[PDB]
């Protein structure tokens, strides 16, 4: 039912400096933390109302990881332009997404740690959280460096520990918004479904299937039967 | 809560 996710970007500049590091944290589509490297004194910023109750030590533990990452990701980009024979004169990007999924029960369903270079898949942690998945001969270079540094074991201990403890804690503090399900307001072609939460909805074959778009009130919209979590019974629509 | 990167964790 619930999940946590961190999204990183490490984008190259045209000279010897200075790459930009953005980090963003989510609890099922709801942005809660944001760090941007560009600023005189970059700090991790709250984005959701429920994260504001956290202490100074929490805001500094995050800032230190993200500021170290602003450095650790510069060396990684250089290593990468090195395996791929790229000049300093281009803009190159490393994208990463990691996190945990849990069931209604309260146990970790599966852990994630995925990376991409220049927009496409580069290295990923497997279901057993004990082995890696490489894309090209340059990814097998990263993998060997990771098997040696016991990288998977650290990610597994985090995903099974810290990540589960903090998600359950975030879900508890923000239960009024996170643990609640808003049902879609429907109208009829056109098969509309407005103001629902979460995004996962089924509107029902070769039909006009538009992507799930955000409203700006943390609610969702989309455009036959409307199946959603917030409904105790799947809606039957036809008009006139 | 994010995960820290230990030493030698680079790409």
């Amino acid at each position, epitope marked *: 039912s619930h999940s946590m996710r961190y999204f990183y970007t490490a984008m190259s500049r045209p000279g010897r400096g200075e790459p930009r590091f953005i980090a963003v944290g989510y609890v099922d589509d709801t942005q809660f933390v944001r760090f941007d490297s560009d600023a005189a004194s970059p700090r991790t910023e709250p984005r959701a109302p429920w994260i504001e109750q956290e202490g100074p030590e929490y805001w500094d533990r995050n800032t230190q990881i993200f500021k*170290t990452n602003t450095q650790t990701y510069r*060396e990684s980009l250089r290593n990468l332009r090195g395996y791929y024979n790229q000049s300093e004169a281009g803009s190159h990007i490393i994208q990463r997404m990691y996190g945990c999924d849990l069931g209604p029960d309260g146990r970790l369903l599966r852990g994630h740690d995925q990376s991409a270079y220049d927009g496409k898949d580069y290295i990923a942690l497997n279901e057993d959280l004990s082995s890696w998945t490489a894309a090209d001969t340059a990814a097998q270079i990263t993998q060997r460096k990771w098997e040696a540094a016991r990288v998977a*074991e650290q990610r597994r*201990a985090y995903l099974e520990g*810290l990540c589960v403890e903090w998600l359950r804690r975030y879900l508890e503090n923000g239960k009024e918004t996170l643990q609640r399900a808003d049902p879609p307001k429907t109208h009829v072609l056109r098969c509309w479904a407005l103001g629902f939460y979460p995004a996962e909805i089924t509107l029902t074959q070769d039909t006009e299937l538009v992507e799930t778009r955000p409203a700006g009130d943390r609610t969702f919209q989309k455009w036959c039967h409307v199946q959603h979590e917030g409904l105790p019974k799947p809606l039957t629509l036809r008009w006139e | 809560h994010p995960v820290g990167d*230990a*030493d*030698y964790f680079e790409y």
Partner: T-cell receptor, first 111, second 112 residues
Framework: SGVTQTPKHLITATGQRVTLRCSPR?????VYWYQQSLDQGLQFLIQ???????AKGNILERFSAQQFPDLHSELNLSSLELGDSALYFC??????????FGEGSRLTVLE | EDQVTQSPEALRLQEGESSSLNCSYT??????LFWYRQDPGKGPEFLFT???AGEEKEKERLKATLTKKESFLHITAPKPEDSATYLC?????????????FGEGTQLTVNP
């Protein structure tokens, strides 16, 4: 272990400056500084990785360090006070996670 | 947040008399738990690393266990040569790097 610290012993007066030197274990890229005072535990000062500052502990403004491109580290302690008398250890980290300690620098500060 | 507590501070044993050294810790998350042996005025020497709970490492007369809250160093039939101060250190995966937070040590003396 393979970590080499120098000088093993230093005797100085109060107000003086000293430089401690450290060579990390062959192949290691990181340098960690700890202070072990008498009848006290190992306290973390600062970390350097590949010539660059990383985690910084309880290091004093009176104190500064650096890691050179050759990978060696220098820890500078200035305006020395009696309380600065300690065993200063340097350690280098291995890929698997463990830190390998040097044999330490025993500083004695006298009036 | 990061703290290690070893107990007892000093341990006094007779030769061949087994004992346990305790090390309680708190972390945001555990990367690993380290056991070191330090001889008076010398650099701490690495014994073993326990990565997860249930894990066990044994080197001669030393056996190290791990739980979510504590680690034990079991010393079977000690000898005077085993006398040293035993250190425990913890690594946090809720922070950057490989830094260790040390306990204050358990000073062991084995009366021959």
């Amino acid at each position: 272990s393979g970590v080499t610290q120098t000088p093993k012993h230093l005797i100085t007066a109060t107000g003086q400056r000293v430089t401690l030197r450290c060579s990390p274990r062959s192949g290691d890229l990181s340098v960690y500084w700890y202070q072990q005072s008498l009848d006290q535990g190992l306290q973390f000062l600062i970390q350097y990785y590949n010539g660059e500052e990383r985690a910084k502990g309880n290091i004093l403004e009176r104190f500064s360090a650096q890691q050179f491109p050759d990978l060696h580290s220098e820890l500078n302690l200035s305006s020395l006070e009696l309380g600065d008398s300690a065993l200063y250890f340097c350690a280098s980290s291995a890929r698997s996670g463990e830190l390998f300690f040097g044999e330490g620098s025993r500083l004695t500060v006298l009036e | 947040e990061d703290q290690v507590t070893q107990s007892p501070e000093a341990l006094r044993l007779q030769e061949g008399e087994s004992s346990s050294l305790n090390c309680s810790y708190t972390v945001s998350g555990l990367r690993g738990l380290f056991w070191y042996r330090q001889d008076p005025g010398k650099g701490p020497e690495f014994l073993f690393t326990l990565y997860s709970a249930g894990e066990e490492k044994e080197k001669e007369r030393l056996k190290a266990t791990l739980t979510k809250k504590e680690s034990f160093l079991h010393i079977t039939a000690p000898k005077p040569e085993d006398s040293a101060t035993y250190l425990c250190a913890v690594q946090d995966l809720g922070t950057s790097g490989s830094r260790l937070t040390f306990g204050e040590g358990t000073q062991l003396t084995v009366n021959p």
